[PDB]
Enzyme design. Structure first.
Site, PDB file in Angstrom:
ATOM      1  N   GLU A   1     -46.488  -0.503  31.090  1.00 23.45           N
ATOM      2  CA  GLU A   1     -45.665  -1.311  30.249  1.00 23.45           C
ATOM      3  C   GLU A   1     -45.450  -0.411  29.043  1.00 23.45           C
ATOM      4  O   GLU A   1     -46.339   0.310  28.677  1.00 23.45           O
ATOM      5  CB  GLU A   1     -46.478  -2.582  30.026  1.00 23.45           C
ATOM      6  CG  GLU A   1     -46.574  -3.123  28.579  1.00 23.45           C
ATOM      7  CD  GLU A   1     -47.501  -4.336  28.259  1.00 23.45           C
ATOM      8  OE1 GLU A   1     -48.688  -4.196  27.920  1.00 23.45           O
ATOM      9  OE2 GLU A   1     -47.012  -5.465  28.321  1.00 23.45           O
TER      10      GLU A   1
ATOM     11  N   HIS B   1     -35.745  -2.782  30.982  1.00 23.93           N
ATOM     12  CA  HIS B   1     -36.009  -4.045  30.268  1.00 23.93           C
ATOM     13  C   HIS B   1     -35.311  -5.150  31.053  1.00 23.93           C
ATOM     14  O   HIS B   1     -34.279  -4.835  31.643  1.00 23.93           O
ATOM     15  CB  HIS B   1     -35.411  -4.041  28.863  1.00 23.93           C
ATOM     16  CG  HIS B   1     -35.764  -5.199  27.926  1.00 23.93           C
ATOM     17  ND1 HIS B   1     -36.643  -5.247  26.927  1.00 23.93           N
ATOM     18  CD2 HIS B   1     -35.241  -6.464  28.037  1.00 23.93           C
ATOM     19  CE1 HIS B   1     -36.681  -6.476  26.455  1.00 23.93           C
ATOM     20  NE2 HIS B   1     -35.821  -7.211  27.148  1.00 23.93           N
TER      21      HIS B   1
ATOM     22  N   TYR C   1     -38.335 -10.849  34.544  1.00 26.92           N
ATOM     23  CA  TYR C   1     -38.318 -11.250  33.190  1.00 26.92           C
ATOM     24  C   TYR C   1     -36.901 -11.661  33.096  1.00 26.92           C
ATOM     25  O   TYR C   1     -36.632 -12.127  32.018  1.00 26.92           O
ATOM     26  CB  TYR C   1     -38.488 -10.117  32.230  1.00 26.92           C
ATOM     27  CG  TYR C   1     -39.907  -9.768  31.882  1.00 26.92           C
ATOM     28  CD1 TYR C   1     -40.650  -8.928  32.702  1.00 26.92           C
ATOM     29  CD2 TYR C   1     -40.481 -10.401  30.775  1.00 26.92           C
ATOM     30  CE1 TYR C   1     -41.998  -8.735  32.427  1.00 26.92           C
ATOM     31  CE2 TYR C   1     -41.828 -10.217  30.494  1.00 26.92           C
ATOM     32  CZ  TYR C   1     -42.576  -9.388  31.330  1.00 26.92           C
ATOM     33  OH  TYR C   1     -43.935  -9.254  31.069  1.00 26.92           O
TER      34      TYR C   1
HETATM   35  N1  LIG Z   1     -29.710  -6.559  22.467  1.00 29.43           N
HETATM   36  C1  LIG Z   1     -30.985  -6.832  22.289  1.00 29.43           C
HETATM   37  N2  LIG Z   1     -31.843  -5.957  21.741  1.00 29.43           N
HETATM   38  C2  LIG Z   1     -33.155  -6.167  21.837  1.00 29.43           C
HETATM   39  N3  LIG Z   1     -33.765  -7.153  22.477  1.00 29.43           N
HETATM   40  C3  LIG Z   1     -32.888  -8.125  22.871  1.00 29.43           C
HETATM   41  C4  LIG Z   1     -31.506  -8.045  22.750  1.00 29.43           C
HETATM   42  N4  LIG Z   1     -30.867  -9.207  23.193  1.00 29.43           N
HETATM   43  C5  LIG Z   1     -31.872  -9.883  23.715  1.00 29.43           C
HETATM   44  N5  LIG Z   1     -33.142  -9.363  23.496  1.00 29.43           N
HETATM   45  C6  LIG Z   1     -34.427 -10.093  23.818  1.00 29.43           C
HETATM   46  O1  LIG Z   1     -35.379 -10.222  22.750  1.00 29.43           O
HETATM   47  C7  LIG Z   1     -36.716 -10.067  23.265  1.00 29.43           C
HETATM   48  C8  LIG Z   1     -37.036  -8.606  22.870  1.00 29.43           C
HETATM   49  O2  LIG Z   1     -38.127  -7.959  23.595  1.00 29.43           O
HETATM   50  C9  LIG Z   1     -36.568 -10.310  24.780  1.00 29.43           C
HETATM   51  O3  LIG Z   1     -36.361 -11.649  25.213  1.00 29.43           O
HETATM   52  P1  LIG Z   1     -37.478 -12.712  25.531  1.00 29.43           P
HETATM   53  O4  LIG Z   1     -36.844 -13.731  26.357  1.00 29.43           O
HETATM   54  O5  LIG Z   1     -38.158 -13.093  24.285  1.00 29.43           O
HETATM   55  O6  LIG Z   1     -38.472 -12.079  26.466  1.00 29.43           O
HETATM   56  C10 LIG Z   1     -39.684 -12.735  26.672  1.00 29.43           C
HETATM   57  C11 LIG Z   1     -40.892 -11.754  26.654  1.00 29.43           C
HETATM   58  O7  LIG Z   1     -40.707 -10.804  27.711  1.00 29.43           O
HETATM   59  C12 LIG Z   1     -40.945  -9.551  27.117  1.00 29.43           C
HETATM   60  N6  LIG Z   1     -40.209  -8.516  27.780  1.00 29.43           N
HETATM   61  C13 LIG Z   1     -38.872  -8.646  28.136  1.00 29.43           C
HETATM   62  C14 LIG Z   1     -38.273  -7.820  29.018  1.00 29.43           C
HETATM   63  C15 LIG Z   1     -39.043  -6.770  29.599  1.00 29.43           C
HETATM   64  O8  LIG Z   1     -38.635  -5.827  30.249  1.00 29.43           O
HETATM   65  N7  LIG Z   1     -40.390  -6.832  29.359  1.00 29.43           N
HETATM   66  C16 LIG Z   1     -41.048  -7.632  28.408  1.00 29.43           C
HETATM   67  O9  LIG Z   1     -42.279  -7.544  28.186  1.00 29.43           O
HETATM   68  C17 LIG Z   1     -40.721  -9.556  25.659  1.00 29.43           C
HETATM   69  O10 LIG Z   1     -41.667  -8.620  25.160  1.00 29.43           O
HETATM   70  C18 LIG Z   1     -41.140 -10.992  25.323  1.00 29.43           C
HETATM   71  O11 LIG Z   1     -42.528 -11.055  24.939  1.00 29.43           O
HETATM   72  P2  LIG Z   1     -43.004 -12.193  23.870  1.00 29.43           P
HETATM   73  O12 LIG Z   1     -42.456 -13.577  24.396  1.00 29.43           O
HETATM   74  O13 LIG Z   1     -44.485 -12.318  23.938  1.00 29.43           O
HETATM   75  O14 LIG Z   1     -42.324 -12.066  22.558  1.00 29.43           O
HETATM   76  C19 LIG Z   1     -35.234  -9.632  25.055  1.00 29.43           C
HETATM   77  O15 LIG Z   1     -34.736 -10.003  26.391  1.00 29.43           O
END
Ligand SMILES: Nc1ncnc2c1ncn2[C@@H]1O[C@H](CO)[C@@H](OP(=O)(O)OC[C@H]2O[C@@H](n3ccc(=O)[nH]c3=O)[C@H](O)[C@@H]2OP(=O)(O)O)[C@H]1O
Length: 190
Positions: free
Chosen positions: A148, A21, A65
């Site tokens: 994904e 992630h 990301y």
């Molecule tokens: N401790 C935590 N536990 C859980 N989640 C946490 C925590 N602290 C932070 N987060 C964040 O909460 C979201 C959870 O997926 C992500 O951030 P984002 O900036 O919205 O991340 C932006 C977007 O990138 C996506 N995404 C992120 C990383 C990746 O590997 N791939 C991907 O598709 C998310 O799905 C999200 O999609 P949506 O914007 O369409 O919601 C993540 O980084």
């Protein structure tokens, strides 16, 4: 019919299924405390069917990301984590990225978020071939060889998290430094 919504030749059960992630600036050190859901509205995806914790096979694809989100002008970046599920997890590769055809051909209640239903004892059981949990899977992005992994939100908690890399120390230089990182594939996919 389950068969025309799921690719069985790309699903499997696995011992200690790891995926990566991308974590934004701030949020690195609390995510290594662990996964549990956001309260601030998004929680994965815009559409309800698809909210869940999103991860990937490819750490490079993960790394982009780790950037921005209100101000790309600071060149920072947080890092990448390898999250890992304890023991036995199935990965149900969907052959269809569309939820009512997914719920109808798999025979799922026609009016829930599909990621709510992946969560149930009844979905883990019915589709997990003895797995503690099921993670859905669709590819990364057009023409990309990476997949994904859409993790359910509750079954996601029980994940454990180690630091794969951390661009959050290079403050101004994070995003630049990240390119260098993503330039290891062409140079280390081999
Ligand atoms: N401790 C935590 N536990 C859980 N989640 C946490 C925590 N602290 C932070 N987060 C964040 O909460 C979201 C959870 O997926 C992500 O951030 P984002 O900036 O919205 O991340 C932006 C977007 O990138 C996506 N995404 C992120 C990383 C990746 O590997 N791939 C991907 O598709 C998310 O799905 C999200 O999609 P949506 O914007 O369409 O919601 C993540 O980084």
């Amino acid at each position: 019919g389950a068969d025309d919504v799921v690719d069985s030749s790309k699903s499997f059960v696995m011992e200690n299924f790891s995926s990566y992630h991308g974590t934004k600036p701030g949020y690195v050190d609390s995510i290594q405390k662990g996964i549990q859901k956001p309260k601030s509205g998004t929680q994965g995806n815009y559409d309800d069917d698809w909210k869940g914790f999103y991860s990937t096979d490819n750490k490079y694809d993960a790394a982009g990301y780790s950037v921005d989100n209100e101000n790309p002008l600071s060149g920072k970046a947080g890092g990448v984590v390898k999250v890992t599920y304890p023991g036995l997890t199935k990965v149900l590769a969907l052959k269809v990225d569309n939820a009512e055809t997914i719920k109808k051909e798999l025979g799922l209640s026609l009016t829930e978020p599909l990621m709510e239903q992946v969560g149930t004892e009844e979905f883990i059981k019915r589709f997990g071939d003895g797995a503690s949990r099921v993670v859905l899977s669709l590819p990364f992005a057009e023409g990309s060889s990476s997949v994904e992994y859409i993790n359910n939100w509750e079954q996601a908690k029980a994940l454990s998290v180690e630091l794969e890399i951390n661009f959050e120390t290079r403050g101004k230089r994070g995003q630049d430094a990240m390119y260098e990182y993503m330039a290891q594939a062409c140079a280390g996919n081999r």
